[PDB]
């Protein structure tokens, strides 16, 4: 009655035939060699990420999908900066699970493939689709570990993937549903389900005004949708006074550009302009689910960016919480405006680290596309921790420069202390990062521009087309390692 | 001239129709007591049937004003005045016929007509020139919204022309 996904490796030069995983070889034994026999008859060997489906092998598993895992011993690939074996497993298991789903089978058991966490990630990421609003849906598939030996690692993969899928849900949902208020309520319920050691404050416009967040308010005011400032606390440290790590996420729930209005083409993707808030909030939910013994604060200014008779006008000058004035030359450079105020507020926590994420610039997509999230940081220690985490998760990061060269192009400003768009078109992600740095005094800060990793087409084999929720798992892995130190 | 430069350079969220009128008022009054200033509100603009001006202002939530300034410098109070008129668009987004993003910030200076004529009148008063002068500056923003001018709309000017 269930489907079964089993792995096979590529044949090594010294082997007579490609080797099954332990689970594949055991299943083959159970069916008196019929799996190997039919795989032989079926023709060419299964290469990494490829699948083949065999029917009627066992009364309990009418459909068995064998998936190619590539080289058994594939480890860290220094030319790709990731663990290749884990990436092979995520892709192959995703492909196998999609095939089971296409056969309309509601239950699947999955070979741990020598790394149950990566297997669970492939299945759970691989099956995910946002289809709440559609009458016609694929069968809902319940994936479970095949066997009972690798359970903690399997559940850890489920938890990591579910954190990323939460971010994908939050990003994909249409903006008329995923308003600042709705986003805050969904993160609140998820965080509270994860741990009772949690406080959530959905701070209203009146509080934003009391906090003198003039830069954030200037963005929100064009729209009739109320802004909120989401503040989430996870109190995981055994010492309540232990300084927290602080995450900050850009939560623009829809970006029209405002008065500096965007072109029509593909503007619908701007419902995911709260991806920064989605990924940092989701990572914190997952950290709470993991019980990590650390204090964490999440901060997400949430609003829409819309044109109207009260919107930001090019040339307007606004005052950030820290008292710096900003000339708003381009109203579509709104993420740095809202982040200025959130980053300022971040310092009030005495944090150990400040990490922000934002779908910030088109220039980042032109620079590195969906190959890797761009990381700008004043701490090589912090860069290296994020980079090492990314190797394990496969959700890659790539360092980008914080140089005074770019700063000079944003503090050169006709009316104010800093200009919100550079003097030139060049290096847009770098001048955006330099603008943020004018609101940071902390010695361990990282800015992640995730505009290029906002969506997947087919680049990441285990994510279906749509909002990607990257790099949620790299953030979770970073927090997990930090908590062990 | 520097007064006009200040008025033009200031960001439009500070230099609103109301703020512009208040700054010109204080400068003119500091220049001479022989001065009247009327910061005419929307109700007066409507009473004056200025439908063409109102049609521009309505897209924005920023209140329009019609600034009227008198400098009574002639020894004869009945001497006909010279009249100056200045365009006071405090910010021009283009409205529904919206401008491109590039350098749109310079449109904070779309009240430069009002700035230069008002400033010249302030300076004339500072100079004690023996002439009667009236300055007129319709001031509003030009913004897109759910109540803005729509291409093809027909409006009626004060003189009755459509």
């Amino acid at each position: 009655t269930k489907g079964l996904v089993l792995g096979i490796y590529s044949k090594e030069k010294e082997e007579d035939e490609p080797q099954f995983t332990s689970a594949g070889e055991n299943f083959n034994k159970l069916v008196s060699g019929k799996l190997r026999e039919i795989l032989n008859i079926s023709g060419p060997p299964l290469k990494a990420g490829k699948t083949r489906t065999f029917y009627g092998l066992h009364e309990d598993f009418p459909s068995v999908v064998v998936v190619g895992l590539g080289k058994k011993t594939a480890g860290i690939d220094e030319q790709e900066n990731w663990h290749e074996g884990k990436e092979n497993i995520r892709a192959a298991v995703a492909a196998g699970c999609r095939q089971i789903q296409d056969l309309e089978i509601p239950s699947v058991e999955v070979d741990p493939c020598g790394d149950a966490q990566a297997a669970a990630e492939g299945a759970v990421l691989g099956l995910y689709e946002y289809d709440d609003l559609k009458q016609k849906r694929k069968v809902v598939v319940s994936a479970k570990l095949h066997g009972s030996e690798d359970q903690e690692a399997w559940q850890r993969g489920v938890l990591f993937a579910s954190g990323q899928n939460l971010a994908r849900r939050l990003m994909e949902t249409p903006a008329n549903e995923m308003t600042p208020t709705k986003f805050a309520e969904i993160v609140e319920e998820n965080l509270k389900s994860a741990s009772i050691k949690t406080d959530v404050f959905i701070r209203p416009k009146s509080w934003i005004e009391e906090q003198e967040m003039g830069s954030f308010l200037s963005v929100a005011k064009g729209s009739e949708e109320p802004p909120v400032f989401l503040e989430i606390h996870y109190k995981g440290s055994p010492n309540a006074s232990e300084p927290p790590l602080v995450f900050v996420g850009k939560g623009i729930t829809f970006d029209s550009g405002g008065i500096s209005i965007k072109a029509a083409a593909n503007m619908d993707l701007m419902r995911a302009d709260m991806g920064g808030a989605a990924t940092i909030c989701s990572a914190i939910v997952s950290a709470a689910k993991l019980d990590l013994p650390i204090n964490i604060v999440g901060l997400a200014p949430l609003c829409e960016n819309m044109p109207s008779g009260k919107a930001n006008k090019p040339g307007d000058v606004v005052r950030a919480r820290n008292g710096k004035t900003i000339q708003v030359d381009n109203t579509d450079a709104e993420g740095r405006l809202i982040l200025a105020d959130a980053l300022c507020y971040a310092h009030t926590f005495n944090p150990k680290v400040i990490i922000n994420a934002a779908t910030l610039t088109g220039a980042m997509d032109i620079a590195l596309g969906s190959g890797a999230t761009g990381v700008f940081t004043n701490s090589s220690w912090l860069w290296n921790k994020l980079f090492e985490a990314s190797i394990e998760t496969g959700d890659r990061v790539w360092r980008m420069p914080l140089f005074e060269h770019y700063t000079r192009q944003v503090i050169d400003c006709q009316l104010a202390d800093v200009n919100n768009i550079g003097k030139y078109r060049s290096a847009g992600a770098c001048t955006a990062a330099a603008f943020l740095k004018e609101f940071v005094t902390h010695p361990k800060w990282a800015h992640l521009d995730i505009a290029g990793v906002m969506t997947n087409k087919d680049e990441v084999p285990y994510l279906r087309k749509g909002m990607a929720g990257r790099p949620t798992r790299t953030l979770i892995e970073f927090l997990f390692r930090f908590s062990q130190e | 001239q520097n007064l006009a430069r200040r008025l033009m350079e200031t960001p439009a969220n500070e230099m609103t129709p109301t703020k512009f009128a208040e700054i010109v008022e204080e400068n003119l009054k500091s220049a001479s007591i022989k001065t009247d200033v009327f910061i005419r509100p929307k109700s007066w603009i409507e009473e004056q049937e200025m439908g063409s001006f109102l049609s521009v202002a309505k897209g924005s939530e920023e209140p329009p004003v019609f600034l009227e300034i008198h400098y009574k410098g002639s020894p004869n109070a009945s001497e006909p005045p010279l009249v100056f008129v200045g365009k006071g668009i405090t910010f021009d987004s283009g409205g529904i016929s919206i401008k491109a993003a590039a350098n749109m910030d310079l449109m904070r200076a779309d009240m430069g007509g009002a700035a230069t004529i008002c400033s010249a009148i302030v300076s004339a008063a500072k100079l004690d020139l023996p002439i009667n002068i009236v300055g007129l500056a319709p001031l509003c923003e030009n913004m897109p919204s759910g109540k803005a001018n729509k291409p093809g709309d027909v409006v009626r000017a004060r003189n009755g022309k459509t």
Partner: peptide
């Protein structure tokens, strides 16, 4: 932000 767009470029440009």
């Amino acid at each position: 932000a767009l470029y440009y």
